[PDB]
């Protein structure tokens, strides 16, 4: 009979990708059971608490910081895709239009906050210190001529505050659920050669299990690459 494999995922793109791989896995004796979560904490907690076998929602910087903060030992299995992060505005059409004292909201977790600040640096809105890392904070800003006010709120909440700020830097999974189009709507956007490949994550006990390996291989398949390309039209970039 089939091997059970339970995977927590954010709904878009992750759970969509998993729904498309699920039949391929069934044909290799693996019964993939997908559980959707809307947040960036519970998928890890569920795996670490031995409730689910794996998850698919985060990048490696986030994982490493999560294990540090929580004292857990979740491990990456394979990389799947990149979601270049965009800056969105309901009020302005290009960065040059941002007013003095503009409110710019970014995620309040260490890695996605740092990532957002790095995009602001790349786009020339602010400048970060020369020795900055990818966990930069607003304290690391060395130039802010427009006196931008950097606001920090939980990642999932940013689409809901978009109309109440001048600009928001929104994780693509959340942007796509909100019907934002990163390639058309973004005022600035990351490149895809970045630290932020989204990874399948599991535990030491199952990373090298037969079922886990079959899932990992399916997630590098030509078929999944095609799905990602046609479905997300460049908003989600295959990492293989
Ligand atoms: C929980 S780390 C952020 C994950 C999100 N899908 C991104 O790539 O931006
Ligand atoms: Cl753990």
Neighbours of 70 (CB within 10 A): 13
DSSP 2: P
Residue 52: nearest ligand to its CA? 2
Q: In angstroms, rounded to a whole number, what is the distance separating the alpha carbons of residues 204 and 41?
A: 19
| Contact between 184 and 112 (Cβ < 8 Å) | no
91-to-102, 103, 158, 159, 161 alpha-carbon distances in Å:
11, 11, 15, 14, 12
| Contact between 228 and 192 (Cβ < 8 Å) | no
| Protein residue whose Cα sits closest to atom 3 of ligand 1 | 58
Method: X-ray
Give distance in angstroms: CA of 111 to centre of ligand 1. Answer: 10
Instruction: Specify the resolution in Å.
Output: 1.6
Containing 198, the helix (H) or strand (E) segment is: strand 198-202
| Protein residue whose Cα sits closest to atom 2 of ligand 1 | 58
Per DSSP, the residues of 61-120 read HHHHHHHHHHT---EEEEEEEE---EEE-SS-SSGGGPPTT-EEEEESSHHHHHHHHHHH
Residue ranges and CATH numbers for the domains of the chain are 1-85+191-240 (3.40.190.10), 86-190 (3.40.190.10)
Residue 63: nearest ligand to its CA? 1
DSSP 125: S
Q: Which of 116, 110, 65 is nearest to 88 (CA)?
A: 116
Give distance in angstroms: CA of 171 to centre of ligand 1. Answer: 6
Q: Which of 197, 223, 106, 118 is nearest to 158 (CA)?
A: 106
CA atoms within 13 A on the CB side of 185: 22
* Ion ligand 2 residue ranges (Cβ < 5 Å): 48, 72-73
Give distance in angstroms: CA of 72 to centre of ligand 2. Answer: 4
């Amino acid at each position: 009979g089939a091997e059970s494999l339970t995977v927590a995922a954010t709904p878009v793109p992750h759970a969509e990708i998993l729904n498309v791989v699920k039949p391929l896995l069934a044909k290799e004796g693996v019964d993939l059971k997908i559980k959707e979560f809307t947040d960036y904490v519970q998928p890890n907690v569920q795996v670490s608490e031995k409730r689910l076998d794996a998850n698919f929602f985060q990048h490696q910087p986030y994982l490493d910081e999560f294990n540090k903060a929580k004292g857990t030992d979740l491990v990456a299995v394979t990389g799947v895709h990149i979601e270049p992060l965009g800056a969105y505005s309901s009020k302005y059409k290009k960065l040059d239009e941002l007013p003095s004292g503009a409110t710019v909201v970014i995620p309040n977790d260490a890695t996605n906050g740092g990532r957002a600040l790095l995009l602001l640096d790349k786009a020339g809105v602010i400048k970060l210190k020369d020795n900055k890392s990818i966990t930069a904070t607003p304290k690391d800003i060395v130039d802010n001529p427009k006196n931008i006010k950097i606001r920090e709120l939980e990642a999932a909440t940013l689409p809901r505050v978009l109309t109440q700020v001048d600009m928001a830097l929104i994780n693509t999974n959340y942007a796509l659920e909100a019907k934002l189009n990163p390639t058309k709507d973004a005022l600035a956007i990351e490149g895809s050669d970045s630290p932020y490949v989204n990874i399948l994550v599991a535990r030491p006990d199952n990373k090298d299990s037969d079922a886990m390996q079959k899932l990992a291989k399916a997630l590098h398949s030509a078929e999944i690459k095609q799905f990602i390309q046609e479905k997300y039209k460049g908003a989600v970039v295959p990492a293989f």
